[model samples]
Target: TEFKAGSAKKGATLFKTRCLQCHTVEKGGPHKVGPNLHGIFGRHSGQAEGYSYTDANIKKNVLWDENNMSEYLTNPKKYIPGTKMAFGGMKKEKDRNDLITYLKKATE
Candidate 1:
């Protein structure tokens, strides 16, 4: 399946507005309320260094690809029960796509 890409510029804006408080995408960025999201794509859950993860998150052991990322972004708690991320979830498809796009670019 072809995964459509979105506007990285808009994604960066959304990232600042919604995710900056919790996540940091730059390489070597320190963990905030959430883990630094650098290299999150293609990784497994609960793998970031120096960050304590919920038992559920470590146990889930999900492969972090676009589909899983989209689903998790849409509903974090539901995606991984007992996970500690407090985000309410992004509802709009375009917005989610844009954010994921920026994350893939910036987090690398």
Candidate 2:
């Protein structure tokens, strides 16, 4: 499932509204209910330092690429059966695409 590039500007709005409460996207950002997502573009799931994750995620050995995040953000519980991410997930495809765009830039 491929699409065109998303807008960081619009994505920023989606990120703030949908994910800011749980995840932060800047280097050395604070970890909240979810780990700070700094440098997450190609990072493995559950491998970030200083944050606790469910064993299921840590052991999953999955990469966090744009495509992967798109699927996961579509359905976190279904994507990672045991992941403890609290949100039900944003069901809109545009929202997921936009968020991924924002992350690719902001999660440096």
Candidate 3:
């Protein structure tokens, strides 16, 4: 689905408040818990530079598309088994959708 850019901008605010503590999008945001989210969608999982990912994450070679993002956002442990995303999966579908839209916009 074509997510609206306005929704993405809103999502960006939400992400900063809720997720920026762990997930970094800028060139040098701190990597406390998760890898940098810049250009995440469409990229290979666990392939970001300098971040050491879990073995399970490295073994899983799926691209981060909408479908996969949806699943991962619903339940991270179930999606990857040993992912380091300690933030419990997002429960709201709209939030996940908006976050994906935001990520696409931010990376572009």
Candidate 4:
């Protein structure tokens, strides 16, 4: 969980292939089909600026941190049914880890 402990570089590539279709990574970026993921690391789910979330997500009031994110990324529907995140989820453990690594670094 430190620098070079994971591969943000690989994660960034993962995002381009996977998440960028729905989410935006840049700070102050406009909301995409999903939401701007600029400050997602420690935020509350369903509360990103200018983004609309499903009622299910709002009611959940999830804390956006490592533990929950790891589980959530494993299975989007299983973790939060009725979520707007229609994604089946990232299947590879390494991809998920690397993606989160990239998120943590890129958001900074």
Candidate 5:
């Protein structure tokens, strides 16, 4: 099935609570403990400049298209072993949809 967009507004809230501590979604945003996530879609994993990434991530390099991104958000550890992301995973599909939706727009 094709991935569908969710509520950007709700996703913004989700991002504030779940991701703002580590990531920034704005253009020219600063890199925190994690890299600035501007223009993330279609970018190869671990290619964000100035961010030190785990070997596992660089080796698993792939486009951050919808399927890969959704699966990664569902479970970071499972998706890429030895990643330093430290996220426990977003369990709700609805929330993932919303967050992805927000990122698709915001990070562009």
Candidate 6:
């Protein structure tokens, strides 16, 4: 099932607390440790302008679909070994789902 508005709002709050420091989704937000996520979902991984991505991430050729997002949220390092995101993967399935929902809404 897709996410509703409430789920997206919760996810946005979670993202601000947990993710905004490293990643930015706003149109012109500064890129911190991680790349900006302005239009991440459905887009090719490591394709953002001006940001240098690890070769491994580029080679992974990831498309941010729901299933891929779920896997990545569960285990980012396992999914992409050289990724710069240092935070341990989110353990809660609901948070992962909500985050993906937020991402979809933000990009749209």
User: By lDDT, who's the top model here?
Assistant: 5
Best-fitting candidate, measured by TM-score?
Answer: 5
Model 3 lDDT, residue 54, Cα:
94
**Residue-wise C-alpha lDDT for candidate 2, range 1-108, written one tens digit per residue:** 564467889999998888888888888789999999888877898888889999889888789888888888888888888988977887878777777888888987
> Who is ahead in lDDT, 1 or 4?
1
Expressed as tens digits, the lDDT of each residue in 4-84 for candidate 4 is 335889999988998888888888888879988887878888888677799988888899876678788889888888987
Model 3 shows how many backbone clashes? Answer: 0
Local distance difference test scores for all models = 0.90, 0.84, 0.78, 0.81, 0.91, 0.82
Error of 4 at 104 (Å): 0.8
Give the higher-TM-score candidate: 2 or 5: 5
Weakest ten-residue segment in model 6 by summed lDDT:
1-10
lDDT of 4 at 58: 85
Instruction: Give the clash total for candidate 6.
Output: 0
Per-candidate clashes, comma-separated: 0, 0, 0, 0, 0, 0
lDDT of 1 by residue, 30-103 (tens): 99889998899889999998999999999999999877898898999999999999999998888988988888
> Residue 103: error of model 4 in Å?
0.5
Q: Write the per-residue lDDT of candidate 3 for residues 1-108, one digit (tens) a residue.
A: 533333787779878977887887875665667887777778889888888899988887869886787778788888888877776888877887788778777765
Q: Where does candidate 4 stray beyond 4 Å? A: 1-5
lDDT of 2 at 16: 84
lDDT of 2 at 107: 86
Q: Candidate 5: deviation at residue 36, Å?
A: 0.4
* Per-residue alpha-carbon lDDT of candidate 6 for residues 1-108, written as tens digits (9 for 90 to 100): 443333888889989988887898987866778898887878888898888888988999999877787888888989999887787988888888788888878866
Better candidate number, 4 or 6, judged by lDDT: 6
Report the poorest 10 consecutive residues by lDDT, candidate 1. Answer: 1-10
